[PDB]
């Protein structure tokens, strides 16, 4: 599952392509209703003081909250190019979550800090950050530690 580095690179590349494609497609005006997005700021200081389990639940909560935000986001975007984009994004997030649950384990989901965003560009940027921040660091530093 998520143990494969190529899987993480493919997820990052697909999210980047989606972000680029959103800019080309016009009529991306934000909706009044906000979209709740996960807590992706990781302080380099609180990365030695957190054990494997706490980080695992934090990342699972982050990805799950991202999925719920996108699901609302698709529901938000009326069927259009920008919905096709949100559908591709939902597929991306679902693929990442399915990969993570195989290696990292279901364990127990947790809820972190809650952030509200307006435009879909924020959704794409936050997904790119999740595949850049906590997920990338845990899968690149605790790779051999947690996979076996």
């Amino acid at each position: 599952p998520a143990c494969d580095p190529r899987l993480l690179n493919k997820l990052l590349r697909d999210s980047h392509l989606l972000h680029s494609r959103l800019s080309q497609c016009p009529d991306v005006d934000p909706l009044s209703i906000p979209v709740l997005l996960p807590a992706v700021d990781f302080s380099l200081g609180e990365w030695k003081t957190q054990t494997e389990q706490s980080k695992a639940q934090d990342i699972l909560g982050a990805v799950s909250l991202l999925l719920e935000g996108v699901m609302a986001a698709r529901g938000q975007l009326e069927p259009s190019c920008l919905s096709s984009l949100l559908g591709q994004l939902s597929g991306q997030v679902r693929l990442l979550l399915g990969a993570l649950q195989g290696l990292l384990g279901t364990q127990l989901p947790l809820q972190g800090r809650t952030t509200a965003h307006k435009d879909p560009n924020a959704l794409f940027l936050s997904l790119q950050q999740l595949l850049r921040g906590k997920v990338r660091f845990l899968l690149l530093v605790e790779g051999p530690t947690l996979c076996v």
Binding site: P1, D4, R6, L7, D14, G91, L95, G98, A99, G102
Partner: protein, 283 residues
């Protein structure tokens, strides 16, 4: 091979973005949710049975790395029917490589197979393989020789997605028809070998401080070729081969010091055909 002939229930994913389950409704469930009916059409055929086939909409429904439970709910009595638990991760039947446009570049027995992968987003996972047989087929479909497409330094999935490879061992002479099929590697994505490609009748250019190439042409024929100064940077090349006019058996050209030479002698008769004598590269 055939896309449908690749097991109480059979399912197959050609890009891991679409899934198709068939046997001989087709209710399916992803973990915990209210089951829904995959859109099914009856492909009646006298040779086989009813051959009920449905294709998932390929919209947020082919999610990977998740256990999928299949139970058949016939409208007779809604009793227990064929079941199968599958990983769309682990039932992949990838589509064959397309736009093969393979040419016999590099070594005389070498066959460059730079292909545009039909699925560009999963070309890293799929572990392709090829079957090549002579056009004569003196033993029918006996020559099923298969060379695995591992990620060696000369056969990677380079961009412009697509990919390329440098499969060797093909004897010089008659044009070789070859079909590539794609199967997920197994480290992360699993599945069965994909359907074979449409047999493409590619050919290889047969066989044969300045250096002179003393070559003689036969009767009522031509004499032309090119010389590639690739500087042996990478084993594969892009789709378009380099073209360099052989301007003078007395061809003269400027080449880099201690550099490889991709020579080529091409002969085309009055009718018009491919008939080439390729020589091994020199340092």
């Amino acid at each position: 091979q055939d896309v449908f002939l690749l097991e109480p229930l059979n399912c197959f994913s050609q890009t891991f973005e679409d899934l198709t389950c068939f046997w001989d409704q087709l209710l399916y469930a992803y973990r915990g949710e209210k089951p829904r009916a995959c859109p099914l059409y009856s492909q009646s055929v006298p040779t086989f049975g009813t051959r009920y086939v449905c294709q998932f909409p390929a919209q947020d429904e082919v999610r990977l790395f998740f256990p999928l439970h299949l139970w058949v709910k016939n409208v007779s009595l809604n009793q227990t029917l064929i079941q199968r638990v599958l990983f769309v991760d682990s039932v992949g039947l990838p589509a064959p490589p397309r736009v093969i446009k393979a040419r016999g570049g590099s070594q005389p027995g070498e066959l460059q197979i730079h292909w545009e992968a039909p699925a560009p987003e999963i070309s890293d996972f799929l572990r392709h393989e090829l079957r090549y047989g002579p056009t004569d087929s003196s033993n029918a479909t006996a020559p099923s020789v298969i060379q695995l497409l591992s990620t060696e330094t000369c056969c990677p999935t380079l961009w412009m997605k697509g990919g390329s490879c440098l499969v060797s061992g093909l004897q010089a002479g008659k044009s070789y028809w070859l079909q590539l099929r794609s199967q997920p590697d197994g480290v992360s994505l699993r599945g069965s070998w994909g359907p074979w490609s449409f047999p493409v009748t590619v050919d290889l250019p047969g066989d044969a401080k300045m250096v002179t190439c003393q070559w003689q042409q036969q009767d009522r024929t031509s004499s032309q070729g090119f010389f590639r100064h690739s500087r042996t940077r990478c084993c594969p090349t892009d789709r378009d081969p380099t073209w360099e006019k052989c301007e003078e058996s007395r061809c003269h050209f400027k080449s880099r010091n201690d550099s490889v030479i991709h020579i080529l002698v091409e002969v085309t008769t009055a009718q018009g055909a491919v008939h080439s004598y390729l020589g091994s590269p020199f340092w």
